[PDB]
Amino acid sequence: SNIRENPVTPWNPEPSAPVIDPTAYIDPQASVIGEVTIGANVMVSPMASIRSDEGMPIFVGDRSNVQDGVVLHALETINEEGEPIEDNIVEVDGKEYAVYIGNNVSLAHQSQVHGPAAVGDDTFIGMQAFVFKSKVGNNCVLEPRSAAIGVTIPDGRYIPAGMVVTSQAEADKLPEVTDDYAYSHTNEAVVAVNVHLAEGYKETS
Amino acid sequence: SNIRENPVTPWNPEPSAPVIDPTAYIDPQASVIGEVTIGANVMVSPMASIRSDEGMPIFVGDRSNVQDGVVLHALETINEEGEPIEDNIVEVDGKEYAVYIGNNVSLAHQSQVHGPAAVGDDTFIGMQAFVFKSKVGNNCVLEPRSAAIGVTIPDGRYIPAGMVVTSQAEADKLPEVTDDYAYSHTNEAVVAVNVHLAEGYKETS
Amino acid sequence: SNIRENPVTPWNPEPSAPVIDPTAYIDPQASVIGEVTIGANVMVSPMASIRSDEGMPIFVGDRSNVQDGVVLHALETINEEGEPIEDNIVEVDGKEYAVYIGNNVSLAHQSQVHGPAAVGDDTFIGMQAFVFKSKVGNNCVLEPRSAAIGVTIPDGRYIPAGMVVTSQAEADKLPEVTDDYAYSHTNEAVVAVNVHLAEGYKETS
Ligand SMILES: [Fe+3]
Ligand SMILES: [Zn+2]
Ligand SMILES: [Zn+2]
Ligand SMILES: [Zn+2]
């Protein structure tokens, strides 16, 4: 089966199975393993791998999409001594996650978000982009091949294609999304399309 | 099944199934969905995803190869009002495509071509490279980790490893493939090998 | 089947099947094809592709891990005339390989090692990183999105995130891993975790 429980390990005494909204579409060639919550109208495309086997949840909010070849995984959040590793946990609205993906977020083909990480609502994570040990605000755009490592990206900023942002000083000076910016409407178009695709694929299963 | 029709959606009243030449080899762990044409002696490797579900065809010419983990997909080419989005369509020899891959083209492991895009004959798209909203000429080489976004790459040029080309002024000044260039014969060697691999894999099915 | 022989071709008269230690865990959604040796306690994750069909072995040492979406493949090592192509072969401890991955090595999500290549013991190859025509020493760290092409990386060095190293002069001046370096203990933590994951996943099969 492509939707599976995680295994018993020293930090995981009890396997967890994914909680998937009935309106989500999970492609038969995607893999979803472990403590994962997937929200309404989410599309998970072929060859995506969402794997939550190192403790604590990976959450994917409503009307988000996880495109072909995308990987979601996270660093260990509970050591063998049962103790939570606080550095590897993100907090969003009073709850703890290994990876938090907000609502209306697009994770475009071959991108990767690796916990600890949070991605705010209405954000586009571009093709082949990378997010690790970072919090990405709402209404952001990571252009294709950009990366954010170890930083907080403020709401409404974009990272130009190919740029790798590793310092908070850099992240603080990223340009703003404006109406004339080439990717300012990309995420809303992509979300609308993928919500329709998920419904159409559901009608084939 | 790993070869599948695309779904019914507002822009796609009738599902299309892939048209695949009998001499092509499609790995059982690849995915090919929707309005896709695959030519003679093409090799499609494990974990590749070719997905044509947003309108108009993805074409892969004869003796081309689509290696492990490669993604082909395209932006919407027909809006919900049935109207063609001309910005998202490429024209090659009087025909319209969402993605056009020419003959004898190598899409090497983990690369991605995202429509609208065209790739001319005898071109090598290197490992992890990225092509989006671009036309790449014939006899070109994209070295590993290069990218072409929003540009036209003239015939016979190469992009050095890791370079991300986003402006036409940059693309116009790319170096030429010459006989002493390290990748000048790479594509022809790779094409010959993959044509033989496709035949050998066909004999195992 | 996801574990398969390679095909008969002009350079490969006899198919080879993978040799896999009984304590290794190969995910059902990974692909392993051809002349491949996988050592003890190795974890091979969903969507990884290890493909040895162009001659000579791909070796993955004990307690190594091959994470989601990783690709291992190699250039042709035997031409159609039966003659070994020495440029495309690496030698490690008196034996020849197309790709050699040492013991306790982590190939993190979406990375790729393409032969000819060798990766020494206790080395971390970071997320989305790329190694091709290179020898990477022991105790090295390739940070996410780094790449080494055509070079030898000395023992105990790291490549900063996003850096693409293509010249030996560059590789010779890479910084050293020290105890205060952010990734100095990452590989040992990741190896220990993955050895435990492999055992837990084995208990589900
Ligand atoms: Fe797969
Ligand atoms: Zn991970
Ligand atoms: Zn797409
Ligand atoms: Zn290859």
Full DSSP string of B53-115: -SSS-EEE-TT-EE-TT-EEEE--SB-TTS-B-GGG-EEETTEEESEEE-TT-EE-TT-EEEE
Q: What's the rounded Cα separation, in Å, for the pair C184 and C80?
A: 45
The class (CATH top level) of B1-205 is: mainly beta
From the candidates A5, A76, A96, A170, give the one annotated as an active-site residue: A76
C-alpha A198 chain-centroid distance: 17
Q: Is A53 on the interface with C (CB under 8 A)?
A: yes
**Resolution limit, Å:** 1.8
Range 129-148 of C in CB contact (< 8 A) with A: 144-145
Q: How long, in residues, is chain B? A: 205
Determine, for residues A10 and C203 on separate chains, whether the beta-carbon distance falls below 8 Å. Answer: no
CB atoms closer than 10 angstroms to residue B1: 8
CA distance A113 to chain C (A): 10
Q: Kindly state the tokens that stand for A143.
A: 């252009």
Amino acid at B190: V
For tokens 């304590």, name the residue.
C23
Torsion-angle region of A202 (φ positive above 0: left; ψ -120 to 50: alpha; else: beta): alpha
Closest Cα to residue C47, out of C18, C73, C70, C79?
C70
Q: What's the rounded Cα separation, in Å, for the pair A21 and A63?
A: 11
Experimental method: X-ray
For residue A202, give the H/E element and its range. helix A186-202
Distance C156 CA to ligand 1 centre (A): 34
Catalytically active residues of B, by annotation:
54, 76
Q: Is C76 a catalytic residue?
A: yes
Q: What's the rounded Cα separation, in Å, for the pair C88 and C98?
A: 7
* CA distance to A78, B117, C119, per residue, from A5 (Å): 18, 40, 33
For tokens 């003679």, name the residue.
B40
Distance C17 CA to ligand 1 centre (A): 20
- Assess contact for A143 and A177: CB atoms under 8 A: no
Q: What's the rounded Cα separation, in Å, for the pair A139 and A118?
A: 13
Q: What three-state secondary structure class fits A87?
A: helix
Task: Give the HSE-up count for residue A120: Cα atoms under 13 Å, Cβ half-sphere.
Answer: 16
State chain B's maximal CA–CA distance in angstroms.
52
Amino acid at B105: V
Q: What's the rounded Cα separation, in Å, for the pair A21 and B185?
A: 51
- Assess contact for B190 and B108: CB atoms under 8 A: yes
